[PDB]
Amino acid sequence: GSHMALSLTADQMVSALLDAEPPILYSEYSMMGLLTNLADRELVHMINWAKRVPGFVDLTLHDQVHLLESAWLEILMIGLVWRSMEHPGKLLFAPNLLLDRNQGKSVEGMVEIFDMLLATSSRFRMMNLQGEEFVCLKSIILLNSGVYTFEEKDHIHRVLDKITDTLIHLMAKAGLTLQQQHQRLAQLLLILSHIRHMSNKGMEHLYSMVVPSYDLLLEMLDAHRLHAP
Amino acid sequence: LTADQMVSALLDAEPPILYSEYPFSEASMMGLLTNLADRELVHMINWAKRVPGFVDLTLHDQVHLLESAWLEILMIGLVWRSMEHPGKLLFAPNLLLDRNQGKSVEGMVEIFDMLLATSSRFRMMNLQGEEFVCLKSIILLNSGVYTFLSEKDHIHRVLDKITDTLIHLMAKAGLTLQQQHQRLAQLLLILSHIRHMSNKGMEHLYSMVVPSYDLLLEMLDA
């Protein structure tokens, strides 16, 4: 059978998001080349993951591609900062690609982006971000980042409301007071503004020096239909 | 301060609505929009000094936060004022510009479209004045808080207090517990889009003006 997104309980939402989680990939081996190769491989898995975020396949294909084109670098970044949280001062791009600030100095313009990513990872560490919170934030990014550069918009907002309910549930079951739930919610959501900022400055840097286009993402999203179950 | 005193302090500190210099070309429009921005900036400083918690920061921290947030602050203002003018941006009472007028300036129309989509979002949520001021203060305290080079708990403490406040206004207005977190989230997710617009606006302004760190410091110090 199939669950419609708005019917899911918080436990079904959490389970759906955990089961959709992509794998941790390895670097295949210049720093930019490694980071580009890794991003390209991550993107394949990201398509598979997006298709499994409750609500996403309710949208038309052209709206799917809108959302993913807006969000893909933020998505890459949040998963990076997540994985990096237990390595203070380092970015765990892969288990065999743990880079420090000084290594970021090898590409002109890169240290400023490395520094921002690091500040984010350290902020998640200090908040003790949990895996089940992470997955909710990541799915938020996907449905939100492109929501305002477009009845159907209502649906995405209702899905977003379900994810917020889900984060609140997690926080209430972890023993936070109603007031602490609201504060922690707000703190996590304001970090999302910083992720957007990092993605904007990242895009500018990539364009200053090939990035996933609209057309590429469209094709990838479409091609997913042909993959073996 | 109580949630109610926070709200009164913020409303009290609001800046004044300004007029644009008393049909439009591109040089004329950019100049109008630049001059209005420059004039808003001195009032923005006075507003920033009365956001509770902000004067307790060191001068350098004040400047960093303002430098990071200034454009999002103007933009949120603008979007707020434009709420009731669907398809138009109310830069001033005597400067109400539509999409098409945007197209006078190469690159501008995209930023215009995004600002209109925000205004139209705020309209559909029925954003209230008391919520607006809380959001604007959140931007000032949050935008630059993760981009410091190296106290920051102080800013986080204030940010938490605006959250409480946002909730209390919702509770006052009779939202259920569930509705309160859902609204909170909806409002704070819009701040991502404000941030994005500020980034895109910075790039667009760099294709041509922008207040320096040192100028901000002077103005805040004086």
Ligand SMILES: O=C(O)CCN1CCc2c([nH]c3ccccc23)[C@H]1c1ccc(Cl)cc1
């Ligand atoms: O240049 C910048 O300022 C942004 C750099 N990006 C930082 C985030 C990021 C990159 N590769 C990744 C692989 C996995 C996770 C996160 C990343 C890299 C990256 C490199 C190339 C491409 Cl096409 C996409 C992302």
Ligand SMILES: O=C(O)CCN1CCc2c([nH]c3ccccc23)[C@H]1c1ccc(Cl)cc1
């Ligand atoms: O070109 C862009 O993408 C950004 C354009 N900005 C949009 C928001 C904005 C401008 N002037 C304003 C005056 C009041 C409120 C909002 C604004 C204008 C602007 C013009 C000059 C300067 Cl220095 C700053 C802001």
